[PDB]
Amino acid sequence: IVGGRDTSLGRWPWQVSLRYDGAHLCGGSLLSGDWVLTAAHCFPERNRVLSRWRVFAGAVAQASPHGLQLGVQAVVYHGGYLPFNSNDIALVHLSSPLPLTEYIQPVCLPAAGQALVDGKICTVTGWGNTQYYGQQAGVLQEARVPIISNDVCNGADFYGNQIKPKMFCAGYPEGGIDACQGDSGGPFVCEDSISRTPRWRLCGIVSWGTGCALAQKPGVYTKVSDFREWIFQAIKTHSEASGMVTQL
Amino acid sequence: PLYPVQVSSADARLMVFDKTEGTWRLLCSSRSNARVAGLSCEEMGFLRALTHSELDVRTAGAAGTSGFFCVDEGRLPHTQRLLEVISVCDCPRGRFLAAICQDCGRRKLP
Numbered sequence: 001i002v003g004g005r006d007t008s009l010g011r012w013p014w015q016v017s018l019r020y021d022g023a024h025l026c027g028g029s030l031l032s033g034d035w036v037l038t039a040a041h042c043f044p045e046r047n048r049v050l051s052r053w054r055v056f057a058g059a060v061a062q063a064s065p066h067g068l069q070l071g072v073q074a075v076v077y078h079g080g081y082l083p084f085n086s087n088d089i090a091l092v093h094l095s096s097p098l099p100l101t102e103y104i105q106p107v108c109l110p111a112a113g114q115a116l117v118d119g120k121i122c123t124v125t126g127w128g129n130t131q132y133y134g135q136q137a138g139v140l141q142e143a144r145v146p147i148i149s150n151d152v153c154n155g156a157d158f159y160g161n162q163i164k165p166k167m168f169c170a171g172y173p174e175g176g177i178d179a180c181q182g183d184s185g186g187p188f189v190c191e192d193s194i195s196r197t198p199r200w201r202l203c204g205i206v207s208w209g210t211g212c213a214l215a216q217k218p219g220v221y222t223k224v225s226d227f228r229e230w231i232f233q234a235i236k237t238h239s240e241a242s243g244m245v246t247q248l
Numbered sequence: 249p250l251y252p253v254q255v256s257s258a259d260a261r262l263m264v265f266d267k268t269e270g271t272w273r274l275l276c277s278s279r280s281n282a283r284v285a286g287l288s289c290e291e292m293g294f295l296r297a298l299t300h301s302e303l304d305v306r307t308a309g310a311a312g313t314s315g316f317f318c319v320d321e322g323r324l325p326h327t328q329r330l331l332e333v334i335s336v337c338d339c340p341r342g343r344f345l346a347a348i349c350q351d352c353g354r355r356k357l358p
C-alpha cells in the first residue's frame with residue numbers, strides 16, 4: 001500500500017497473510033473461521049503444494065509471535081480465470097478453524113442486489129510494498145480510496161478498455177495512494193448500515209494495476225457482488241475437498 | 249436504504265419488508281425453515297445461518313411487525329432471492345422463524 005498508514009490490532013480483524021514457504025505472497029479476507037477469500041492468481045502452477053502454504057492471522061506486524069498460523073486443506077479457484085484477468089477470485093479452506101476473538105473476525109459480503117456506489121470512499125489494507133521499488137510493510141497499512149466509474153477507467157487515458165464488467169477501479173486520478181505488489185488477494189471494504197448496524201463488507205479483492213500510485217493508473221479489483229453465488233456454491237460443494245479444485 | 253430483509257439482534261427473528269404497506273412482516277414457520285433460514289442470511293450478506301428456531305407470537309410478541317409472509321416451498325429450491333417466493337398469509341399457528349446468521353463486519357475492541 002502506497003500512501004497509507006500503519007494501522008493497529010483489531011481494526012481490520014478479517015485481514016490475513018498467505019505465506020508460501022515462509023514468504024508473504026498475498027493478502028486474503030476471512031469469510032468465517034475456516035474460509036478465506038483471495039485472488040486466483042496467487043496460485044500459479046509453481047505454488048500449488050498446499051503443505052507449503054500457511055495463513056497468518058490476528059496480528060498487524062508480520063513478525064508478531066502472537067498471530068496464529070494454520071494450514072490449508074483446499075483451494076477452489078474460478079475456472080473462468082483464463083490466465084490458468086476476469087474471474088480473479090479463489091477460496092481457501094483452512095485445515096482447522098481460527099478462533100474468533102477481538103483480533104480475528106470475518107468480514108461480510110454485499111447483500112443481494114447491493115450495488116457499488118461510485119465515488120464512495122472505502123479502505124484497502126495489506127502488507128505489500130509501500131513504493132513499487134520498495135519493500136513490503138512490516139506493519140499492516142490502511143488507505144482510503146474512492147470507487148471510480150468504469151466510464152472513466154476504461155477511457156483511453158486510464159486503462160483503455162481493459163476494465164471488464166466484473167472488476168472496478170478505485171484510486172485518485174492524481175495517483176499517490178494505491179494498493180501495490182504484495183497486496184494482491186486482500187480486502188477492499190466499504191461500511192454501510194443497511195442491516196441497521198454499521199458493518200464492513202468486502203466489495204473488492206485487490207487484483208492488479210499498472211505500477212502503483214501513478215496518476216491515471218488506479219488499482220483494479222475483482223467485484224465481489226458478481227461472485228456471491230459462485231461463493232455460496234463453492235463452499236457447499238467443496239467443504240470436504242482437499243487439493244486444488246476449480247468451480248465455474 | 250434499509251435492506252428489505254432484517255434479523256433482530258434481540259431474538260434473531262426474521263423481518264421482511266412489505267412495500268405495498270410499508271410494514272415489516274414475520275416469516276411463518278414451515279417444514280422448509282432450514283433452507284429459508286439459510287437463504288435469508290445469504291440474502292443479507294452473511295455467509296450462512298448457524299442455527300434457526302421457531303418463536304411463538306404469544307410468548308415472544310410481534311415486536312412491531314404487522315402480519316406474516318409464507319413461503320412457497322415448491323418454488324423455494326429454484327430461487328436465489330427470498331422476496332420472489334413469498335406471499336402474505338395468515339400463519340394460523342402464529343409460529344415464525346428466527347435465524348442466527350454468522351456475525352461479520354464488526355470490530356470487537358473495547
Ligand SMILES: *[O-]C1=C(O[C]2[C][C][C][C][C]2[C])[C]=[C][C]=C1C1=NC2=[C]C(C([N])=[N+])=C(F)[C]=C2[N]1
Pocket residue numbers: 025026041042043044047178179180181182183184206207208209210211212213218219220
Ligand atoms: O499480485 C502480484 C503478483 O502476484 C504474485 C504472488 C505469488 C504468486 C502469483 C504471483 C504472480 C506478482 C506481481 C505483481 C502483483 C501485483 N501487482 C499489483 C499491483 C497493484 C496495484 N498497482 N494496484 C495491486 F493492488 C496488487 C498487485 N499485485
